[PDB]
Amino acid sequence: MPLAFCGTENHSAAYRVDQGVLNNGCFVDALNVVPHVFLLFITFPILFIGWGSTWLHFPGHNLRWILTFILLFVLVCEIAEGILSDGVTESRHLHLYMPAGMAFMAAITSVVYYHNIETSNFPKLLIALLIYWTLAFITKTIKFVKFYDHAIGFSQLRFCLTGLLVILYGMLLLVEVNVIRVRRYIFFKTPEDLQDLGVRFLQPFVNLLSKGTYWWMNAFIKTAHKKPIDLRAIAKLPIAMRALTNYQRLCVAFDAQARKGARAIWRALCHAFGRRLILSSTFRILADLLGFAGPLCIFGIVDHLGKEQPKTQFLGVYFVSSQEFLGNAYVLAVLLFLALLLQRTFLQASYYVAIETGINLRGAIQTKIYNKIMHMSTSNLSMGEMTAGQICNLVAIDTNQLMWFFFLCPNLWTMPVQIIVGVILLYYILGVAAVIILLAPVQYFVATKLSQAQRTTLEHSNERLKQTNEMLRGMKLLKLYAWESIFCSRVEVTRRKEMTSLRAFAVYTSISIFMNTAIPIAAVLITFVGHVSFFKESAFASLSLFHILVTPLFLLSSVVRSTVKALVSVQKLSEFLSSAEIRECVQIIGGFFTWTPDGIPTLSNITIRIPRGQLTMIVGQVGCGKSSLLLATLGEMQKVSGAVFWNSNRSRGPVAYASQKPWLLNATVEENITFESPFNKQRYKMVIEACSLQPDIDILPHGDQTQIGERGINLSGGQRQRISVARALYQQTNVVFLDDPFSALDVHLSDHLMQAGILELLRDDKRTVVLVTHKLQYLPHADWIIAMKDGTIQREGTLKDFQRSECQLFEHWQRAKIPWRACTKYLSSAGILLLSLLVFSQLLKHMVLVAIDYWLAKWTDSATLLCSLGIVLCLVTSVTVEWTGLKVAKRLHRSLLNRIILAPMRFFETTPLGSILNRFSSDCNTIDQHIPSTLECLSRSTLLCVSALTVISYVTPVFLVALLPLAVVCYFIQKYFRVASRDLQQLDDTTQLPLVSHFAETVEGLTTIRAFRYEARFQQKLLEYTDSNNIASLFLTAANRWLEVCMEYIGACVVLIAAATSISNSLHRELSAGLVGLGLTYALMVSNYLNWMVRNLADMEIQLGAVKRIHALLKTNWPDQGKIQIQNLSVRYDSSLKPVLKHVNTLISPGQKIGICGRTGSGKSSFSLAFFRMVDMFEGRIIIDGIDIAKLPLHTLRSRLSIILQDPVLFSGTIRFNLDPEKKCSDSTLWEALEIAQLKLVVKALPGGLDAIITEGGENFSQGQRQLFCLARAFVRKTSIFIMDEATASIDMATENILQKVVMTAFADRTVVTIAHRVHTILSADLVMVLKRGAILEFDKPETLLSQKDSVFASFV
Template sequence: ALRVSSAALRTTTTGTIVNLLSSDVYRFDVALNYVHFLVTGPIQTLVVIGLLWMQLGVSCLAGIAYMVVYIPFQLFMGSYFKRFRSLSLKLTDNRLKLMNEIIPAMRVIKMYVWEKPFGRLIELSRVREIRVFQKTAVLKSINLSLYFTSSKIMTFLSIIVFISIGGELTVENVFVSIVLINHLRTIMTLNFPNAISFGAETLISVQRIEDFLLLDEYTPKPIEYSTENITNNYNETKESIYLEIVEENKTNISVNNISSEIVSKEGNVSHILNDISFDVKPGELTVIIGSVGSGKTAVLMAILNELKTNRGSVSVSGRLGYSSQESWIFRGTVKENILFVQTSGSGSVSVSGRLGYSSQESWIFRGTVKENILFGKAFDERKYKQVVHVCALEEDLKQLPFGDQTVVGERGVTLSGGQRARISLARTVYSGPDCYLLDDPLSAVDPSVAKHIFEKCIDLIKFAGDLEIRREEDLSKHHSESVSRLSLRRQSSVASLLSSCLSVDEIIPEEEVNAVTKDADEEYSDDKHKSGKTSSSRIYWTYLRAGAGVLLLPTLLISNVLTQALYTGSDYWLSEWTNYYQNRALNETNVKSWMILDTEVDNIYVFSSLVVVVFVLSVIRTVTFFTVCMRSSVTLHNRLLESVIRAPIAFFDKYPIGMILNRVSRDLESVIRAPIAFFDKYPIGMILNRVSRDLGIIDDLLPSNAFDSIQILMDCFAILVLCILVDYWTVVPTLVLLVLLIIVRQFTLGTIRTLKRVEGTARSPTLSHLASTLNGLTTIRSFGAEKDFSAKFDSLQDRHSNTYFMFMTSTRWFGIVLDQLCLVYAISITITHVSGDLSAESASAIGLTLSQAFQLTTNFQWGIRQSAEVETQMTSVERVDELRRIDREFESEVKPPKDWPSKGQIVMKDVSLHYEGSDSLVLHNINLEIKGGETVGIVGRTGAGKSSIITTLFRMTAPSGVIEIDGIDTSAISLSYLRQNISIIPQEPILFTETVRKNLDPFGDCPDDRIWEVLAKVQLQSTIAAFPHKLDQIVSESGGSFCVGQKQLICLARAILRDNKILVLDEATANVDPRTDALIQSVIRNEFSSCTVLTIAHRLHTIIDYDKVLVLDAGVVAQFGSPLHLINDSDGIFAQMIETTGKDMEQSLRQTALKASIKKQNQIIDDST
């Protein structure tokens, strides 16, 4: 995965790659248990046929003829198994892809109250998948029924022909033939077909893995480290790092007439870059500016060799560093902004030295803050402290409970957007490259922090050669002597597909620190159950009750008992018939069982009737069992889906995607219904792991193994009962065998279960690491950290392989011990009979018990092993059931009046808030009143509590105190009703792989005319109309059909369509250019003029004309009033924030605030008159 090119990686998804590792690779383990039978099966068959010929002569060919017909039938069935397996894998990939989008976006989904439509999407995907599993189950039912009765059919055909040609039944030829036929059945109806079936399924997995391995690879250019051009030394000062640069007449970066283009699936060619040329000299700060879609980020991608060029060349001398601004949404690379495209051509990129890159979407992996900064580099305390200082991280580290040893969740979920951006910048600076590529590094920080970073960090590292995409023009004016600008104009409308739509404007404040943090020493675990305790009977009953109704449960029980009774009874009847023949041959006609009729024809009818009834009952039993299993799987999935959707958001932030997806894929309802804290708490890796693995076991492996274990153990139990009935002396070795089996089973299975759970625990970090690596692939490659991440993956995989190997060897040892015990039992039975009566009548009894005992030797160890496997696989049911029982968000049934809220008045009384896992308050006794129709800007430094205000308003995390909207306490009303009456435009716009219409209106409430009208208002009408399918155009994964600015405009269109009285903007224009920002502000003023608007300010000029400004500091209300009033308070925080914007901007903001104040006063006078 580390070597896949960016263009090739667009053709697949994270879910597909995770599924390759979690499911397809696992198929090899299963197939290797059977594949050798493709060679040994035919050889053993020939040997058994020869022995059968010696007993029955030519009549054995009748039974063999059935087998000859059976084998091609198995090949035919194998083709269907292969077809259904291929289809099920595709459907599973689609479901995992959907889950990979939904789980990270759960916070937004909950705010939009979209749990139901997205829950239906998952259910629909699941229904398609289950239909394929049901078809597979029908085929398995037929196969298993034929396997179960095949020995009876072969025995029946061989004996009937043998009698027809004048053969005399004897104990020897009958029961020796039964043993041989049972062995032949095992070979040709179980082992050989399984080898074909699993082999066919494995070939599909091999093809899928091969397709991935054959994807185009990223080809890194050779990097030459040389001190001839540039020397880099760190000298300690009081507060920063100085870089001593020894220059020559060679430029750091030279871009010569590069061009690049993309080719859509339809074959249309569109230019991304066209004849771009510029030079960056040592010590020069170059700023790339341009409108939306002009190709700013594409230039950096070309320099990093992530974007192929079809003309021109790029030459880099020195070490490059790249830093980004925008937090990662899904994939974490620029490829997500490309719609149905692939790059074409090959240009020339020559690099001499090291590049430092921090991507546009900040990538944070699970680990401590310190580990994220060091990124595998050796720790230098002096250098580390200097980097933390110049990147303005000192105050943030003080706020974290364990400082830089605080473990941040996957995707940096426990950090604010600004903190993620600064950690990404610190990582780049610490790496010490010769040239830095900074992708809008200041847009996510407040004015004072932006000024600090520019003066202490960027203004110093620029001497190494700095190429930067930026929008803080006011800051660059203060350093114009060292700044050169590269202006890019839009090459074509399709260029936006590769652009990240970054703007060139002012400053962006960051959201507060999420208080959900964890101890640095804490490691998540995929499974809490480390002990070897047996899965409780409650789990078995939960599984059975989920699928068996009032009718199915008794049908299943009765069919099992009757089928086994007649199956074993047919052997007993055959022994009586053989005994009758034996006595008749000895002229002992007075000895005849009541079971045997007078004529051979009648006895043949009885035998054939027994075989037919056994087959019919076997089909009924098998179909009923798999029906129960499929219904259990569907029911568990629906329950889990509900629970996951209603889970707290902290759940998803705590557990990795890999772990959750390993469980959730078949039983997802609980997760979707979980409170928001659930999503904050659990890393996405854990979720992905559970979706792809645990429910895969419940769907596929558990039903087959459970049926095997039940069928074989019932057969073994019937054999033991039969042996005791035939000769009561066999009760002694039988009881000894049972006692030994119980001891061995109890001793061994505890270890096996523990190893199985450890194996599951070791698997989740592997999948999480893979998903995280794919998300930060561009950053990893730019830092040359491929070997480190590959070594980490190898270490995790070795840990998993070690535990899996121990698990497999333990099960094999268990099988060997069982084989030995059953062999001793067979010998004991033989000794018991030999030492007793050896009359003709007892000969048939001896033949019957010995044949059954040898059959027991084969079946017992397999049945016990299968039961052990079922018990370990029931932990998957247990793990899924755990997610089903997670806490859900509190949902009141009380609904406010239909016209609520009519004004949009918001009152907070003594509101305090702390996040799960932390006792520290992020909001302290907030008291404020926002009148209906007022516009309020919310500002403050990192950790001030800005986003926590939004969290409490939406009740994502339940606060203390009272929040009233239009006089109604929000904690007393329906949660979904509350959220659907508040509109939000989030900081990170989320789009899903659905139609444009579904992304705007998933409930289908709005007619097309209304949707087109709203799209025209946000200036997206022409863009959507240009799509081939208009509103029904499928949006590519992660919203790749649109640039960031366009995605934000779609979120604005959603808010207009909802038509609510309260609108919340959570740094909504942080990642858009000035033109898009102005458009959003204009639409808000026009469309929401009578609404209450709350805006977390990302640019001060956007809220300077608001009615009021709320200034938060450390979770308390520092200031609340009109912008003009707060500006005039020279000692206040807001006035200080205005001052940090620079003299020109400060003067402009003051004038705007004064004009807005005068305008409002005049409006009040007009309204009063």
């Protein structure tokens, strides 16, 4: 029984070459063999030469790929047909399936060949492929015309298949010769060079296999596991994705639409992105339809295999009828497999095209927003209407969610089509669905109530977090007076109010999961119960349809919510976009200028001229239009009437300017000094000298490298005014405007040195200046002054004019992860009595869903109360999850508060408040309102997945042999993808932060930037920020889609193997395919349960990482003697190299209020810190009124001994709560204190009295009211001693009032120990001690020994 080529029968009569060679119907297949094996036998060594930087794709090549692939599809179909025809027959006969296998391999090799000839630019070498393609087109055309001569027609299948690849090969031969015409290589006598030089990200210019499967990502992601992904490793982002380019295209769209509001933005967005958005929607519709084809193949397979030879015979050859073709079993399985392997590639492509269009929308619209910042007026009507928070929330939230809307925009095209086709094929499947079509509005109303509760919850917990910030800012002051507990109680009360709100949030979000996971069960139950009781007419395919319908509905509910937010956002930006713009030597003639663009000119009759070569000191009344006139010269006022001659020694030059309000960019201080200018040491040193900035630089621990301004080193107002003057002065300009720099700079000697340096700089540059201020010490002397009285110019001339206008009278006046810490979370959070119930209910629910699936299979074979148990268990699990997360967050919150209470003040000195507040608030929010739902979703998704692989292994008990490599591959793919995705996620966050940082620093100092006309550099910084955000966003997106392709093909192979082994055991061993079919419907859902599994697993990784930060914060009658004799108590902090206090055996006598101030460099502050027993006094002996002060409860010791401070602060609350909240002793003591200290005329003038709100520090009480509250605590806490510190900045009368209050404290308490680096006012005392260079050097029990000795008087001089 050997291998006959055509067939052995009739004594070699099929080998009869008589009656023509071509009229033999088997010999033509042998003719069709020739071109395919010819191309193989001429192109394998070539390919091996191939096997042994610059790319150019050939012209007209997309149709090559689609014709080659669709010919792969029909050639696989002819492989199936050849096997099905040669197998049920008596012979072998081997002429049905020898040509197709080499043809399949030939198509594979000719596309590898076309790829290897596209990689290497050598166009004269595709002559072989084209002469091949023409030869095979001719040969199958001959076969088809002889099939036509035998008059077969379309009834038999092989006629149709042959005609299909005839027109296939003809049309793709025509593609080849169109390329021949274009590139003109063979018979003609006679590129992406821009796309060459650039970026790493070559996904839009790569072959189709890498466009589909993200093959180029592979070498990236495998590179990413060894070394991390720096920003330099990220691409340069090519021209087609440059934000400027999309912005130009969009502005052309704007101009075309606006030549021919909300509809304008709508039309503009549609015109700029519809040809891709529509392409994305088209791919999405095709993916929906090929998803919706699946169940037809499963139903057909099970019906024909339950059906338990072909009729036609033309010329002795058996042709399979087409109904029997599409009625076959194995053929439909292979078709199902190839349909899934193409469906689940178009879905990812649709995702990606929507994402790419979204990133270009974000780019162009952010660029447009910033361009219309660059022309927006900074008025008190323009900026006075809309603050910077409005425009910051606009940019951030609006543009990101408009992007998320154009993410969800094809969904609003498909989920309706999804629902309609679901209803249609559910009627074809089950005969004569409203429940499942009623589960998207359930999600809509539940999400609506959830978002309302979340809004209210967030704006309540915002007040809770603000109170916590106000209770964590004064940590040292409240711990010093032992006043932590009352603020902890007011926090725990606000926390429990927020906890009631969070319980309502969790209820309304448990019900979404419950409705989400119990609507299909009731839908199927009502469906089949109708089918039996109400219908009585006649399954697993229907269940799979139930899955395919269930998935879009909740997404569509979110789409509708996003649509509403998008419409509101476009309304917001349209009402924003039509606000007032700005506009289109010195001389101003007509004089009318206002802010509102009509009516009430705010500055009129202005006829003032200031030509070049000048130094104008200006003067005027208080707010008489000085900054208004300066900005009006700058062209920043709506000038109604007048003209502006303008000539720099008609275009404007770089006028330096400095507004009344200072401004500093959140950058380095030298970067905030140089301001995008080259750096020379001389002028920089001169400006640091003139503005006295070298002591200011030394006042900072980095100086010219510290992150100045907001989000960094907190500066002072005089420092910021001086920094602004330095940045204004350095920029090397032909004019200089100084609008009162020494107004806020109250340092007179600094101001005088600055005035002299200003004269020197403006005198040594020979450039015009204009200084508008009230410093009249020099302004009427040697300036060309100009005075604006009542908003008008009086005289711009010499000093004799001010001696002629009654103005001198005023001048005469790695990568480790969760499970240890995650185990600690679940253990310390839950308690096993609810964790066990949660895991048991989840496992039981999934066992019930498996069981009801098997019961559905058996009843369908033979042609309820488990779906009810399922719904109840789903409700139970959703309740248990939300309840467990709520209790978890509650007890963790109280734990965080308790560990923050039991802390030393040295940690607050060490660690910033930002770390404690950040890992408090953001991680508490994450482990309170975001982590439990994701945990529940993971615990439902991976358990559905483990269930599904259990079902596949149960149906086909041979599957597990193929499970082990699939799980190994999934484990390795999970590992390498996790390694890339975590780092890329952090790179996304740390790149999306500086763009909105730029929008803050732009919106703050806008008029200075628009004053310099130095917009293009910030334009480049904006475009750089937008590019650095977009490249990370596109790589994160494309990594997600590549993940989904790789894991989803792993799942597809699982489906194929499971179905194959189940069908193999059901053809012969008769597996009773219901157990097999129920396996298959989990095999289809595996394909996306893995999807949900992988994406949610990454999210579970990142959020449990901030629990790590949580673990890090979990890791760490009245004494009236005053006779505490310290006996040699030596102090240390790290006990490393330098103790400060040494051997100080010093006593404060009763009455002898020893105010002991010393040397401020070495021994002043350390003793002042160590005075409250709040530091490590490493030796000696410290008695306190004869008691042991080294082993006492420090809460009781620090409660009843008041002090004063250097930088005092008032805790906000009731006035009795601001005085003594824990005590609340008596009203008359508070009247005596708050009368006799200070602020009696504010307390009695307060609206409430002792029960009035301390308005966040006493915002309009006094500044001496802080010291008054200190004295209140001194009079209230039975405090004989009162340790006082000096005022940092105060008035001399304020220091005298503090001294008078200290005199009253001496008259009433008489115990005090004060240190003051202001030694010349610290002389009113009783005893003193000077402890210089860390010793007991001087002690003066009379006050005259300080004034008697040399050095103490030298410190007193």
